[PDB]
């Protein structure tokens, strides 16, 4: 028997050569390869394949190559490829990507992907499956921000803060041993992976280092605490000793130096440059030149992504109100005009498309939206396809190259930058089972189901009083992975090696999975997947014109975006 390709894709999801539109964008992803054996596809339900003696093995105990969970027929979108496979989970980790079922009767079964008595099933046919998003610029200001992040497919928050204190409202900082300890204890109740940044400020090593020993996963250098040559230097000395990452929001005011002074203080050491375009902060007007250097891991925050007709009006006003600036004080207007620049925001769109900016992030509740990192990544990719065309490297008419370049910006690249890519950031065997299922019509907009440590944590689901789960109102809801003690097993607290060695988890009574930060100090730009480009970026101090390889980088703002008014009630 043969099955026509339309009916095959409707039953099992798409197969090799089939294309899928991402939401209401112009972007198409094409299935590159498929791990299945045609005729032996796994599926679950009445009279379906995953039944005892059939596609479910009735012999093997859980330890004998049997899965805890099989996601059937997933369309994976990952830096590693765009392809069709079953995904096998065991002990909260991805253990197999391939073909699940019963080797008794099926050909092509991946040997550790047996469906047995112990196996739960999630149907992913007709879903796109991605890694959980890794947001590395989070202000911990309002605990309601966690569901916002989960609803847009974010599973890891790296940042700092103590709630709506002015330090935290401005900076991703949890300062000092006591605030760090308190926020590690708060984290026990947050249904998302977390890593905490200490204050990257001081002129003696001991005040900075004692934050790493207390359980910080990294540091933040911020101009509001003094982004001085001394604070930069001492933070990077701590980081090189402790094997944690340092993020920087540089001296916008150029008070103690210009960009070249900050780069001399960095002295070739690895650093994560936050909101590298500079609307979110940094040396006016040329901070974005950081993104050309081999020791810089450069991220954007989301409010400039992508460049739209309301962007400048929105940002200029937001900067003036948040800094208490007066429209009638010429120094205030000059400062705002030096910081919010259409020239660098337009160039930032193109630097993303070229693989020169490696990462996205939110700046959640400080100057960015907790639930729009994934959303704005795809809106940027879609705008760039419209304005620049398919990238030269594309084939078959697909946008696969662009899709891998852009999915890397919020999955694997932040994880590499932070020293946590051994645990999270991609759909690979041996990594934690943080997985997001998307209906293609909602791709990048609203996650269907968010799996944390192999258990559903968050889902779009309906009336809990109904006969079935789909009746209205369908809304984002926390699921059983967030309830009781299961919140401890489905989530990771990322901590420094020293805090782990010194027994901070046992001292504080932390019950969450403990993740080790490591391998942050001997990476660079070349380690950013699909986004590894180093180049001399010139920013004209008079016109704010950005040039790369002698060419001005400019594009127009757009009046409309996809993934916007078709989807949202407000």
Q: Is 170 annotated as a binding residue?
A: yes
Question: Can you tell me the distance from the alpha carbon of 525 to that of 357, in angstroms, rounded to the nearest whole number?
Answer: 9
Select the residue interacting with its own copies from 8, 40, 51, 497 (CB under 8 A): 51
- Kindly state the smallest distance separating residue 467's Cβ from Ni ion, in Å: 11
Question: Can you tell me the distance from the alpha carbon of 452 to that of 433, in angstroms, rounded to the nearest whole number?
Answer: 6
Question: Of 62 and 518, which has the nearer Cβ to its own copies?
Answer: 62
Picked from Ni ion, ligand [O-], another protein, none, the partner binding residue 21 (CB below 5 to 8 A depending on kind) is another protein
Picked from another protein, Ni ion, its own copies, none, the partner binding residue 437 (CB below 5 to 8 A depending on kind) is none
Distances (CA, A) of 125 to 39, 41, 76, 91, 290: 15, 10, 11, 23, 43
Question: Of 379 and 531, which has the nearer Cβ to another protein?
Answer: 379
Select the residue interacting with ligand [O-] from 95, 346, 366, 447 (CB under 6 A): 366
- Kindly state the smallest distance separating residue 100's Cβ from its own copies, in Å: 13
- Kindly state the smallest distance separating residue 241's Cβ from its own copies, in Å: 16
Q: Which residues of 137-174 are buried (b: 16+ CB within 10 A; e: fewer)?
A: bbbbbeeebbbbbbbbbbbbbbbbbbeeeebbebbbbb
As beta bridge partners, residue 128 has 75, 438
Select the residue interacting with its own copies from 370, 427, 555, 561 (CB under 8 A): 370
Annotated catalytic residue, options 201, 272, 283, 323: 323
* Site track for another protein across 398-437, x = CB under 8 A: ----------------------------------------
Question: Of 31 and 366, which has the nearer Cβ to Ni ion?
Answer: 366
Select the residue interacting with its own copies from 9, 312, 318, 474 (CB under 8 A): 318
By the rule CB under 8 A, 328 interacts with another protein: no
Question: Of 256 and 523, which has the nearer Cβ to another protein?
Answer: 256
Write 233-238 long-range contacts (CB < 8 A, 24+). Answer: 233/265, 233/267, 234/202, 234/203, 234/204, 234/205, 234/208, 235/200, 235/201, 235/202, 235/208, 236/265, 236/266, 236/267, 236/269, 236/271, 237/205, 238/200, 238/205, 238/208, 238/209, 238/212
- Kindly state the smallest distance separating residue 270's Cβ from ligand [O-], in Å: 20
- Active-site annotation holds for 293: no
**Peptide bond preceding 490 in cis form (omega within 30 of 0):** no
Residue in the structure block whose two tokens are 């979110």: 280
- Kindly state the smallest distance separating residue 69's Cβ from Ni ion, in Å: 20
Cβ atoms of 49 and 55 within 8 Å: the answer is: yes
Q: Which of 559, 539, 448, 540 is nearest to 130 (CA)?
A: 448
By the rule CB under 8 A, 326 interacts with its own copies: no
Question: Of 363 and 423, which has the nearer Cβ to ligand [O-]?
Answer: 363
Annotated binding site for substrate: 139, 170, 222, 249, 366
Annotated binding site for Ni(2+): 137, 139, 220, 249, 275, 363
Residues with a catalytic annotation lie at 323
């Amino acid at each position: 028997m043969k099955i026509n390709r339309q009916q095959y894709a409707e039953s099992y999801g798409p197969t090799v050569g089939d294309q899928v539109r991402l939401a209401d964008t112009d972007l198409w992803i094409e299935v590159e390869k498929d791990y299945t054996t045609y005729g032996d596809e796994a599926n679950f339900g009445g009279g379906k394949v995953l039944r005892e003696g059939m596609g479910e093995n009735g012999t093997y105990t859980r330890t004998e190559n049997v899965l805890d969970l099989l996601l059937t027929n997933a369309l994976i979108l990952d830096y590693t490829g765009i392809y069709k496979a079953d995904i096998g989970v065991k002990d909260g980790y991805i253990v197999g990507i391939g073909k699940g079922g019963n080797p008794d009767i099926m050909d092509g079964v991946t040997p550790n992907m047996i469906v047995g008595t112990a196996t739960e099933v999630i149907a992913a046919e007709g879903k796109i499956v991605t890694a959980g998003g890794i947001d590395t610029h989070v202000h911990f200001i309002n605990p309601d921000q966690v569901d916002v992040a989960l609803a847009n497919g974010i599973t890891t928050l790296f940042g700092g803060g103590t709630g709506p204190a002015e330090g935290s409202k401005a900076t991703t900082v949890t300062p000092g041993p006591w605030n760090i300890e308190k926020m590690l204890k708060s984290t026990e109740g947050l249904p998302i992976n977390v890593g905490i940044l200490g204050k990257g400020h001081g002129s003696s090593i001991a005040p900075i280092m004692e934050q790493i020993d207390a359980g910080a996963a990294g540091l933040k250098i911020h101009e509001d605490w003094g982004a001085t040559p001394a604070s930069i230097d001492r933070s990077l000395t701590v980081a090189d000793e402790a094997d944690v990452q340092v993020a920087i929001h540089s001296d916008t005011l150029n008070e103690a130096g210009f960009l070249e002074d900050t780069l001399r203080a960095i002295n070739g050491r690895v650093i994560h440059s936050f909101h590298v375009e500079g609307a979110g902060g940094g040396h006016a007007p040329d901070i974005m030149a950081m993104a050309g250097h081999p020791n810089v891991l450069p991220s954007s925050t989301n409010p400039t992504r992508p460049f739209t007709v309301n962007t400048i009006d929105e940002h200029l006003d937001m900067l003036m109100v948040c800094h208490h600036l007066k429209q009638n004080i010429p120094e205030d207007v000059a400062f705002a005009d030096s910081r919010i620049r259409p020239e660098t925001i337009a160039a930032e769109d193109i630097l993303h498309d070229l693989g020169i900016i490696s990462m996205m992030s939110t700046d959640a509740l400080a100057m960015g939206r907790a639930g729009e990192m994934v959303l704005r990544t795809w809106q940027t990719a879609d705008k760039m396809k419209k304005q620049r065309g398919p990238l030269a490297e594309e084939k078959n008419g697909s946008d696969n190259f662009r899709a891998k370049r852009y999915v890397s910006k919020y999955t694997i690249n932040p994880a590499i930058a932070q020293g946590i890519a051994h645990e999270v950031g991609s759909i690979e065997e041996g990594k934690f089972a943080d997985l997001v299922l998307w209906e293609p019509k909602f791709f990048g907009v609203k996650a269907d189901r968010v799996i944390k440590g192999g258990i559903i944590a968050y889902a779009q689901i309906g009336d809990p009083s109904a006969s079935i789960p789909t009746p209205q109102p369908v809304m984002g809801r926390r699921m059983y992975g967030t309830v009781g003690d299961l919140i401890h097993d489905t989530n990771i607290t990322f901590m420094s090696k020293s805090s782990i060695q010194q027994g901070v988890p046992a001292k504080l009574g932390l019950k969450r999975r403990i993740g080790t930060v490591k391998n942050c100090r001997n990476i660079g730009k070349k380690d950013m997947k699909w986004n590894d480009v180093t180049t001399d970026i010139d920013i004209n101090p008079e016109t704010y014109e950005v040039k790369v390889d002698g060419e001005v980088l400019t594009c127009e703002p757009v009046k409309e975006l996809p993934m916007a008014q078709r989807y949202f009630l407000f």
